[PDB]
């Protein structure tokens, strides 16, 4: 065993262990040694090296590493794989911001290829910081062998999945309506929309839609957006609502019965009543007829039509509203869109072509009035959403896009989710399950340059679609040569055309790339270039036994993994999900870039060590409970767990080497109750931490281990130091070494998944072998002694009571007191087996176990005027409750009743008496639960003297340490002090001789070149010197 510097910094210890791991090839050995054992599989959600790692990564990688180490130690082979998610809109946006250009014209003016190369360059800028973070956190993985989503082989596997999906007919071109900025040409989120409202005055109109082949009858439709009127496709009514034919002069208007008084201006006669279902299929004339709608201009019924707004008859334009889109499609009516991506009318609306639609509202209302189809108009004051980024007005707009018809497999999604164990449980049928229940199809295409190209080619002749699954298929179908080296990115693949298998015309690739969530959801198949290679490795690494990422992946990676795998294989790609809460600052605010309140994990590792950071990320709350993180939280883990272990470990190594202890020898062993207690607690801890870890309960396993470490240091080691300091090697000393040796070996194994650096420092020094090649320890049931555990815990309650009495009266522990006395009802605990440990801990001369109070307390008895409500003889209970007083009170305490005689009669008291235990002169009392402790706080000259001598001893031990003297050396000591110090030292000379290693001790009047130290509040000069 090498010596231990308990003051060695964490950074130095962890770098030393890291060097052992490289020298011993320990990570790779930990995997090879499990060749043949069952496989345990985990997937990491691939991060990106265009940003620095943050404490969110540190939380998730600590949890994955704990699981991997634990499953390795319990008999599994755990292959570790990392990857980089390199496509993704932020990459492209960062290059646009760096170059100062945007939009298709400027990027192509710049050169697509050159633009693509900047994106490539931007994604690994922080690779070196990622390597340092990964290594220093102790997250074992080969960073020379990542998968990378921009590599051809990765992309080729993604194309293979997409082509398989296309084969099933599940990949289609469609439209989806969303809030949309016509200036930025992008769809905004609800949160983005909520940020940008603004108040406006515009026009709403009630429009006449003439009924075909009737005399002067019209549906009336109300709208807030006149510019959608040239694109009318249908009128919707509610099946069950009541409608009237209302006559006004020469015309008849059809509106809802309940809205007619509001919507019609002036009086009307009701000609007839109709349910909306009777209006279904009625043909009408639209207000404009230049846009072609092949199927439409009829009334349809739809449940969302209400009696609370408009006329009850709703104009539908399917490209400018989500309900409009759905209802038109439900009825098999034509989809039309007469507005371009800039919010401008196309050539399909000739009189307004090229103008921004909202700018045309006034001109359309003038046209309606000029054409006699405007029934009513009014000024409208309301709030309208604008673009935070340019305050252009927003629009409801349908872009054309590619979709995967995931809804076609909704039932398989739900079945696969049912097979997953979620942590916490409620995510399964809550956040995640409800997202599945409300599934819409996956909008897969993106109109940008950097990303996985969507591998769909369309014939310019007949629009037939071919989707190459591979480079070989691309080359086979291409109408020209395609080199083996073709890069699967834009623009290279846009220059490849195929021969249409239907008509032999030219096929051109659709221009879009795919959603980055599809790349990362494809990682179970693409990470190993499946099915082109590695089919055995893939099958062994599918599905994952566990993943662990933030709960924000509910609609992200958790969903894209499930969706890609369900589409491709039908199967769930993971068996369990550990969800993580986003880390908070000490104020409970989420850590974010903009606020500057994040704590860098590499900073925290440098200050406190990775063991302490990992512990702080695992302890005191579950992974899915957001942590209020601070440096103080890491410091507490370092002090309570890391440093405490290191100090116990260094104590063992120091004394084992001094005494030449060797676990290989057989010694005569007399084990004490303390030895048996800590070995029992150790195996109880093994048992309980294992159960928790089997269920992924790191928090409770951490808690169990921390309690053990505290008991080990604060009770077992503290109350056994005398056996280690002893001269010789009797049976009780050998038992101490034997016991603490086993404790440290087993505890370092237990800790190995949590705190892998210090665990291996302890284990390798004691055993010569890396802890990370060990098996997780087994509980030895024969060393579990629940009776001893329950006994020692009662002993600890009494120690706590004694200490609290001392603290209450400011009586230092070094100051001996005459006695502690304990009064117990039950003969529950064998107190004589722990008397010496109790007297040592509490520094009392006598420990008395009492069944009674008599010698210790007197009882004062009052009547309880609150409970003695009935008894009207309060003058009698006053005199009856006012030597003989001591005898009568002790009598009523034990018997729990009382019989006092009034002025003539006798009454029977019970629970109507308030009792006061008054400590006798010089005693102080405290109680909890079953136990009452009474401390004799009376100091005497001789007790005070002995305390002074105990403080001299401790001052000498401290000074020897400050001089860095070995603990086994004998010294010549000079001491100078006041007359009380001189006299205490002479009187307790043999106590000093027995507790200090001394060649001589000279009390001198004055000392040359001594050092002044504190003995209590006294100043004493000490000198250590040489003498022949
Ligand atoms: C718990 C989380 C963040 C957190 O706790 O963040 C707290 C710290 C944020 C502070 C940022 C500011 C740092 C710099 C500064 O000071 O300015 C969320 C998790 O993040 C980690 C992982 C990210 C992977 O990419 C996701 C993959 C799965 C997907 C395919 O893309 C993932 O598990 C994610 O769910
Ligand atoms: Zn905008
Ligand atoms: Zn064709």
Numbering used by the authors: 1 to 882, 887 to 1032
Q: What does the original paper state about this entry?
A:
Therefore, to deepen our understanding of mupirocin resistance in general and to infer the mechanism of hyper-resistance, we determined the crystal structures of wild-type PmIleRS1 (sensitive) and PmIleRS2 (resistant), both of which carry the canonical HXGH motif and are amenable in mupirocin-bound form when the inhibitor is supplied at sufficiently high concentrations. To alleviate this problem, we solved the structures of IleRS1 (sensitive) and IleRS2 (resistant) from P. megaterium bound to mupirocin only. The structures provide an important progress in understanding the resistance mechanism by identifying that the closed conformation of the active site KMSKS loop in IleRS2 precludes H-bonding stabilization of the mupirocin’s carboxylate. In PmIleRS2, the closed conformation of the KMSKS loop forces binding of the nonanoic carboxylate such that it is positioned at 4.1 Å distance to the NH of Lys593 (KMSKS). It is this lack of carboxylate stabilization by H-bonding that may strongly affect the IleRS2 affinity towards mupirocin and provide resistance. Interestingly, we observed a kink of helix α2 (from residues 123–126) solely in the crystal structure of mupirocin-bound PmIleRS2. Thus, the MD data suggest that the kink in helix α2 is part of the conformational flexibility of IleRS2 and is neither induced by mupirocin binding nor by different packing environments in the different space groups that PmIleRS2:mupirocin and PmIleRS2:Ile-AMS crystallized in. Structural data unraveled that in the PmIleRS2:mupirocin complex, the tip of the helix α1 carrying the HXGH motif is shifted back towards helix α2, resulting in 2.9 or 3.3 Å displacements of the first or fourth His, respectively, relative to PmIleRS2:Ile-AMS. Thus, in the PmIleRS2:mupirocin complex the HXGH motif adopts the same position as in the IleRS1 structures. The back-shift of the HIGH motif is likely promoted by binding of the nonanoic part of mupirocin to the channel between the HIGH motif and the KMSKS loop forced by the closed conformation of the KMSKS loop in PmIleRS2.
